[PDB]
Ligand binder design. Sequence first.
Ligand code: HEC
Ligand code: HEC
Ligand code: HEC
Ligand code: HEC
Ligand code: HEC
Ligand code: HEC
Ligand code: HEC
Ligand code: HEC
Ligand code: HEC
Ligand code: HEC
Ligand SMILES: [Ca+2]
Ligand SMILES: [Ca+2]
Ligand SMILES: [Ca+2]
Ligand SMILES: [Ca+2]
Lengths: 441, 441
Amino acid sequence: TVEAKNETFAPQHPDQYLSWKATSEQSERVDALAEDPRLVILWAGYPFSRDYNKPRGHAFAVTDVRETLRTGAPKNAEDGPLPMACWSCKSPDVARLIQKDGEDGYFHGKWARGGPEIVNNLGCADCHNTASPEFAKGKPELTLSRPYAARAMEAIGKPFEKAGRFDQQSMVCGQCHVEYYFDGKNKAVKFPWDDGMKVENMEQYYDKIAFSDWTNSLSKTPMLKAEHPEYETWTAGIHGKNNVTCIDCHMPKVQNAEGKLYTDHKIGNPFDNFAQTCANCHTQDKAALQKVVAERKQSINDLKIKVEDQLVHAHFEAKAALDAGATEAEMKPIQDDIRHAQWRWDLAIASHGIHMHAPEEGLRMLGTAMDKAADARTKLARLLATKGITHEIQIPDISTKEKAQQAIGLNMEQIKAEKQDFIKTVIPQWEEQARKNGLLS
Amino acid sequence: TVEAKNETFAPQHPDQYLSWKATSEQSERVDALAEDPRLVILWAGYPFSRDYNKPRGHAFAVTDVRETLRTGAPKNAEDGPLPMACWSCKSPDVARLIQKDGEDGYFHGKWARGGPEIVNNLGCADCHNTASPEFAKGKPELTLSRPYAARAMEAIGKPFEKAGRFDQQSMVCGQCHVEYYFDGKNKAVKFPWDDGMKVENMEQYYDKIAFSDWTNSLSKTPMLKAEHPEYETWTAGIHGKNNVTCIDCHMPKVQNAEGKLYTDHKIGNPFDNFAQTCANCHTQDKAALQKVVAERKQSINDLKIKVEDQLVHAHFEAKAALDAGATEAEMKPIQDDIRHAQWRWDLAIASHGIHMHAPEEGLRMLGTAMDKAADARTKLARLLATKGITHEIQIPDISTKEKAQQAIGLNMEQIKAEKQDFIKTVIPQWEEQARKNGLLS
Ligand code: HEC
Ligand code: HEC
Ligand code: HEC
Ligand code: HEC
Ligand code: HEC
Ligand code: HEC
Ligand code: HEC
Ligand code: HEC
Ligand code: HEC
Ligand code: HEC
Ligand SMILES: [Ca+2]
Ligand SMILES: [Ca+2]
Ligand SMILES: [Ca+2]
Ligand SMILES: [Ca+2]
């Protein structure tokens, strides 16, 4: 009953379909590791040290999860580093499978298993109850197609079905644009929102279940990874406090050539249509508003670099303490500090929109990260001294992405060669197979 | 021609006179050192470690400068810790003396010397050209009565006489509500704005002229003291960027009983008259806006305390290094870091309005302070280890103002008794001479 094949809806909804399809124009894929090699050190031991780009259009979600080095080059349906859950926020086929196989059945196994099943571009079924008679009549019928997201919204005291129109608008974005972790042996997507959506709430939450994402290979710290917390941070910011929704800025109401109103489905930079976005509410002109947002982006970027420099030193200083023979008991309180410092930093800046959505909250977060980075490095200086080291720990050359990846032991030549062979030969097999099974066009 | 006796104007300007006089109702004097005993440590060796209160009504400026422990108990016109310049932002008799004796004449000598001269409350001649025939007709004729403030406004490319009416309104407050230092032999008020008003600009400015306000007596760091930077920080925040003036919030247009509109001169908390302040521009209700401002206040306070705890440790750790025989050369880079860390912290939170005027900027500044505090403490830990110390440095009990003051070697019982006697006996003498000279009554 869930229709994952988006083009089904084109004749009935040409304004929404044509604009939805146009996210393919947002095609630039910017390498964030090249731009910030410190990230390779911070994420040492984790797939994000291999490959991390800025987001681009929705049209590319499927392509990009296939192509990222993070997903590797599985040789069969039970192989590869990552689980089925990596599909969850990329395609309406996820909705299709959850309905067919149930949530547990969908999450079981490896990402590689979903390859010939998850094939349509993030689309209509992700956000709309397309099976409602009202939808054909041109009403939105917004829904949460993801039960893990429905459960999260209830956990914050905001059940979707009791929510008004405007809260529901941001909630559909909130199915994917959130911080999450993989829960249980089968790695189900969960939002860590049980105690609240603030960095302090989530930190306490993860510590109480003793969860870690990975162990940093330099410091041996049990780490937490933050991912794109737009919902949580937008909530904290002044626009969210005034229930200015994701849609007010990213999906403005515009007019077709016949003067009819519709929701613009080309989801991108709100500044690209200032006249229909900020200008609905603000008297300031485009240049003046761009200048403010740019200033905040710079303030955040300057402070973020300072925190990351502290963390790079902390990881290498912990590596030096290990190399001088520090025991697990000696390392533990240091590693607790590093875990908390990096959690705070990563949640502060994992969203590329933080300087717009809640710049004051990103700044505050970075400040609390810096407090724990200070504690870690002071403990480490004292620990190193007990092992007879009283000099500054020198860092290897991390001036480019390539040097940093080399420095942490990654064989990037082999990694990329394996991935490129996977892209060359497996993806077409997946698509050929999906077409044979009627899942794709 | 400056008229420092404010009551002169009462019959011509009864609406402004009566509301100006009403700041006397804002009478609560809150002890900031009691609320945060860490301050006593950070300002060790400076008058601020003795006595520091939150501000109250303008009506109390002359009495508070007289009554603070900071000015002490001078025995004659050439005694006491502080110079004439401490009167500068308290009273229209400053304008009177500047015009009579010239600026250089005014600044010469000790605070004690101006006692029998600076006797009228902060008032009309501080902000108005009262000599103008237009003033008796009811036109404001705003003026800068302080030449150093006029110089500072020119330095930021905003000469007062070329400014529009609305720029001029906030400049009048920016005669006093600024960061300043004492320049040269005679200790003249100067605002450090030559290179701009950002924390980074002022930090570089003071470093280039190798200025310090005092040497912290625990760490022997040459320190910089920040004071109430409202003008600078208001300029950095979104309200300033939008030319919302100090007056828009703090001196709203109100109607008298006969329904005549005038500027309310009872300068206080804008939330006391929300209907004529925020509500002129905002649709949100009073409780909602209060909740937002309180939330930023707590955010800043939380982070401020983290930074302060780091600085308290740094000052004591530096004391331990010194006791362990650290050389001047060994201490120097640490002292640079402490000096910078505390400057950034002090400028961030020296203004009690920062959480309202520019919360993102106060937060940003505190993060940059934390970066330097961390550097200081890491270098300290290494230095201490070279002297055979590898344990954490224990801190004295500083859980109260009294304990903190005892710990830095203040004899508060004696300091307070000398002040009480100064207050009971010298101030009536000053007032007697002023009245005899027709300066007071
Ligand atoms: C609960 C939602 C969610 C899940 C689970 C999720 N993602 Fe994403 N992903 C997003 C969102 C939202 C973006 C765009 C925002 C951003 O990248 O900052 C994104 C972007 C991406 C991108 C493009 C940017 C980049 O990093 O190169 C890739 C590739 C990606 N995800 C792969 C994965 C992989 C691999 C996993 C499993 C570890 C995963 N995703 C799990 C929501 C999710
Ligand atoms: C990323 C989530 C998402 C995607 C995917 C999505 N929509 Fe929408 N859609 C929305 C939101 C949000 C609205 C605005 C609802 C409102 O006004 O309250 C909307 C509005 C609509 C409406 C109501 C008419 C209008 O324009 O206001 C229709 C019909 C529609 N979309 C069709 C489609 C079609 C066809 C597709 C597949 C090409 C699609 N949607 C994919 C989120 C989405
Ligand atoms: C089904 C999960 C999902 C849904 C729901 C979702 N997003 Fe996304 N979004 C993604 C992923 C994944 C990417 C990154 C795509 C890539 O890089 O290939 C992305 C990218 C973006 C970007 C970056 C676009 C660009 O060109 O750089 C923006 C902005 C965005 N989404 C906004 C929204 C808004 C607003 C909503 C709510 C109407 C929403 N998203 C709903 C998953 C989702
Ligand atoms: C008040 C207007 C506004 C609101 C509401 C809003 N956004 Fe944004 N968002 C922006 C602007 C503007 C940018 C780009 C900032 C820039 O140009 O530097 C941005 C950036 C982003 C990005 C980073 C993509 C990129 O690479 O630029 C994502 C993802 C995103 N928004 C998603 C969301 C989500 C999801 C919501 C709702 C939870 C939301 N936005 C609500 C205005 C808004
Ligand atoms: C649906 C109405 C609406 C939209 C659209 C809108 N804004 Fe706002 N904006 C507000 C409201 C409400 C406030 C809070 C201040 C107030 O009470 O007026 C605000 C506050 C702000 C502030 C001050 C707080 C902060 O975050 O620094 C900035 C800057 C700003 N907006 C920029 C933008 C930009 C840029 C856009 C376009 C990407 C935009 N706004 C679009 C309504 C809107
Ligand atoms: C450039 C103007 C200016 C200068 C010069 C100045 N002050 Fe002030 N003073 C202010 C302002 C504005 C306030 C209220 C704001 C605040 O305290 O944060 C204030 C408040 C005070 C208070 C009441 C609050 C407190 O700290 O207990 C005292 C006492 C005081 N000043 C004493 C002094 C002393 C002593 C000097 C000489 C070292 C001095 N002032 C120099 C502007 C100035
Ligand atoms: C802290 C600075 C300051 C103080 C002290 C001060 N004024 Fe004012 N005054 C202002 C400002 C600002 C305005 C508004 C000017 C405008 O509207 O542009 C104003 C306006 C006025 C006006 C014009 C009419 C009106 O109500 O707007 C008169 C007359 C006046 N004040 C009289 C006085 C009197 C009399 C005193 C002494 C009892 C005094 N002021 C003290 C700053 C001050
Ligand atoms: C002549 C110097 C001077 C001028 C001009 C001046 N201030 Fe003040 N202000 C002070 C001092 C000193 C205090 C602290 C008084 C005390 O605590 O005894 C103070 C206190 C205040 C307070 C705290 C009131 C309270 O009850 O806590 C506010 C608000 C304030 N000033 C605002 C303004 C505004 C707005 C203007 C411009 C109209 C400004 N002032 C003009 C020196 C000045
Ligand atoms: C957009 C409104 C607005 C503007 C503009 C404004 N203020 Fe404020 N200011 C406030 C509010 C509201 C508070 C009290 C915050 C609170 O209650 O927590 C405050 C606090 C203060 C305080 C601290 C007083 C105290 O009681 O602790 C001072 C001093 C002050 N303002 C002076 C100024 C000066 C000088 C200017 C111009 C450079 C200015 N303000 C501009 C609204 C404003
Ligand atoms: C002269 C008109 C005016 C006055 C009076 C005014 N504001 Fe604002 N306020 C603005 C403007 C303009 C913005 C920028 C957002 C926008 O474009 O609307 C803003 C933004 C804000 C913001 C969002 C920035 C932030 O800090 O997140 C808050 C909060 C706010 N105002 C609170 C208040 C409070 C509280 C008062 C009363 C003490 C107040 N303003 C009085 C015009 C005004
Ligand atoms: Ca992007
Ligand atoms: Ca996570
Ligand atoms: Ca006060
Ligand atoms: Ca100063």
